Symmetry: C2
Subunit: 392 residues, 2 copies
Amino acid sequence: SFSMEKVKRILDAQRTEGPATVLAIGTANPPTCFYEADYPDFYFRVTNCEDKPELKEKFKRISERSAVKKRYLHVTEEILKENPNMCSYRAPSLDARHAILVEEVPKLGKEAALKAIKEWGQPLSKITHLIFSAMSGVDIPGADFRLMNLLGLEPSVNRLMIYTQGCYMGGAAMRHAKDIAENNAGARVLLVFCDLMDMYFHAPQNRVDLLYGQAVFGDGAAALIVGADPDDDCTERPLFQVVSCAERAVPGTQDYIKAHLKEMGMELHLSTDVPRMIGKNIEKLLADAVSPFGISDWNSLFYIVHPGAVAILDQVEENLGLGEDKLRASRYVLSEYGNMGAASVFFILDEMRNKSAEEGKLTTGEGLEWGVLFSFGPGLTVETVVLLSVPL
Amino acid sequence: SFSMEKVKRILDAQRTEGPATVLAIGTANPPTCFYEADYPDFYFRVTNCEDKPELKEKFKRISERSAVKKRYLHVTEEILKENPNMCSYRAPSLDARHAILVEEVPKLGKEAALKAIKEWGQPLSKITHLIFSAMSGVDIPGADFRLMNLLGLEPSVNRLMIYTQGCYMGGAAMRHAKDIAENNAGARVLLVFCDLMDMYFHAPQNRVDLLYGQAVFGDGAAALIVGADPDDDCTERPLFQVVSCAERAVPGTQDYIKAHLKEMGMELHLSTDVPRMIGKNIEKLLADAVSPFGISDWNSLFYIVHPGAVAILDQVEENLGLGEDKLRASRYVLSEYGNMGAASVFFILDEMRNKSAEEGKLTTGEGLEWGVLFSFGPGLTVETVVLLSVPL
């Protein structure tokens, strides 16, 4: 109990007062922009499948119904010519794909992170934690380690590296950031998502889910700084406050989304019933999250909804009975960027703060006080994050 | 500020008082035991390399100097005959290896977890968090998801899944568990490590690091329940208390440990200078960790030292000037199990509590009050965890 007195001193010192907050957001994308109208022509030519015109028409109809206008993609024609096995279905190409990703993932992560750090305005040495979430590029040491050296973070930065899990990771990694920030006084967390879909590129198949992915998956990186108790003696300023995080595996849906890391790259299996399943469950998930704060009117909230597909946003809008403009920011990111995996919701969060400032709203949350962020991934995992806006 | 009052109620409710504690530990291993004396004969026969007798003698000398007596290995002769490409160097075999691991990783994890849950003595429904750390078996959904269904945890369990990072993950995942447990009143974390080395099995090469791995890497799973503020109204009882966690990337050593996930499996590069590098840095790392508690005599601590190799334990013993019996528990696990990756330190922790009870020591830490746990991995990453024992 002499020792437990010493421990209690340490615990006392580390206490925080307020909730974890997002202090900054920065994003980045691969250079090459692919417009949806032209992608079918590009895709079927570069895979030498122009002799399958019926399949191409089936792909165009999916692309045209996608509500994606354009995407930034790491995979280019030059990369496909340098690595032809990426275009031959099931041919061994994992080594080529990883070679391409192992340097590019941390690199695009740095671009996003630098923008975040710039907004934040504090020295690199104040970053105590780094969380790196990446769909692809599995390597040892990981992208977190590479990013730490690219940025010049302290060698003592506490790191967490999470590979190859899926689109629920936005909400899930935010939960981990929240716990770090709130349990450690002074902690400032750099949270980075970098999702390059190169491993999911394959020659076109007669599979609705593969074609959808080929039409909708986009690339992007987002970085956030998360911390509790913003310091007034510096230019630190909260954008949103993280009130609560919840996660749920929807029973009976294990097989809805599966992806296997194989010699041919990533082998995907994705049910077309995912948007309906989400629509069936969304209201109960929302109610459990915001009922503790007395909220029962769904239209009084601002929304960040992971844009997995346009059907998903429609199902959320419909089953919550939202007004027609409620999901604007979510649809905007789907339109301008496509589905960029876990990074997507933070592109939306970024977009929302900017649109709000631009329109003269009184809060970063479209003028509203309370809001909710939703992430959806395998299998099926749903993240529900309650947010507070900040006044403007 | 109406809303911030509601938030402060939530924050007030979630506060904990004491440090995160390990409430239980359970371990498990693959069925087949391989004795070190016989492994060279097994290894070179089953890979059809008996026509390389000089290389075999070089391997035997490494095995004989390893201080490993036996290991439990998932890779068996039957598996190698069913998947011959595992025996042909650089031949494509990733798909075969993953098939073998995707079910086995969560399965061995369950065996360890069940033992942990049994010791703990509380219902499955009290587990609020699951952290799963696995060297191999990358799959979507992951082993955390599989384990949740195998065990029957609540669908709302908060999950974290960390693949393919290396032996620092023991200390690192403990840090994440500590933050969860201390920031969330009532949280009870199930922390599972399952490390199957199947991806590192290859035909013998004239490479000192590959041969070492082939001689020393073993398989195992360890599960812990971690929580703050043990409840007296139930049979919950702390074994150790987690005082502090620290992490450091040793400058100038990025290339010391590299491993690439490839079509042939895991491609390893490991410097023989790792044990010397650890020995050079260990004292400064220890001093920074326990100086805040006024500790300067290294022999007054109990030790859990990740047994990467016998040279590592020797370098730690020597550069801290430890008495000859200080690292007994660490050497014991290296001897009886080999290097089981991230799970290893918790086998040692388990072993230490048992030996202490058996010998009638007054604490779970060999009768001593303060202790330190060390993890070492890529590149180079060192974890330093300060522990408190519990009286017996």
